[PDB]
């Protein structure tokens, strides 16, 4: 003869439940990304310039060794 016991919601109420779309912005601006890309390209160009000039000098040296040995 005890009290009625049934599955029921708790005293007061259940906590609020989220349902709305949540997609944060989470990114840099286009200007920053373009600037970083162009800077990387320029740095690579200058490094390649130095290395290619050094390689040209090395090729000239090897060709001169061949010229010395040819006769």
């Amino acid at each position: 003869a005890s009290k009625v016991k049934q599955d029921m919601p708790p005293p007061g109420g259940y906590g609020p439940i989220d349902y709305k779309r949540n997609l944060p912005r989470r990114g840099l601006s286009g200007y920053s990304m373009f600037a970083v890309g162009i800077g990387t390209l320029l740095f690579g160009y200058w490094s390649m310039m130095k290395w290619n000039r050094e390689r040209r000098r090395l090729q000239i040296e090897d060709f001169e060794a061949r010229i010395a040995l040819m006769p």
């Binding site: 259940y14 439940i17 709305k20």
Partner: protein, 54 residues
């Protein structure tokens, strides 16, 4: 559920997603938003469960 409610659907609140182009993408967006609205309805049903016989 809004125009001809049957059980207790007149006692819950939700929105109806509407598309504007009539293509697959709009129907996909409608179904995602319907999942969100049914989460809303489930919350309301959880809060308002009454006692009594079944």
């Amino acid at each position: 559920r809004k125009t001809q409610p049957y059980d207790v659907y007149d006692q819950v609140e939700f929105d109806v997603p509407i598309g504007s182009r009539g293509d697959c993408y709009d129907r996909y967006l409608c179904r995602v938003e319907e999942m969100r609205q049914s989460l809303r309805i489930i919350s309301q049903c959880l809060n308002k469960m009454p006692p009594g016989e079944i």
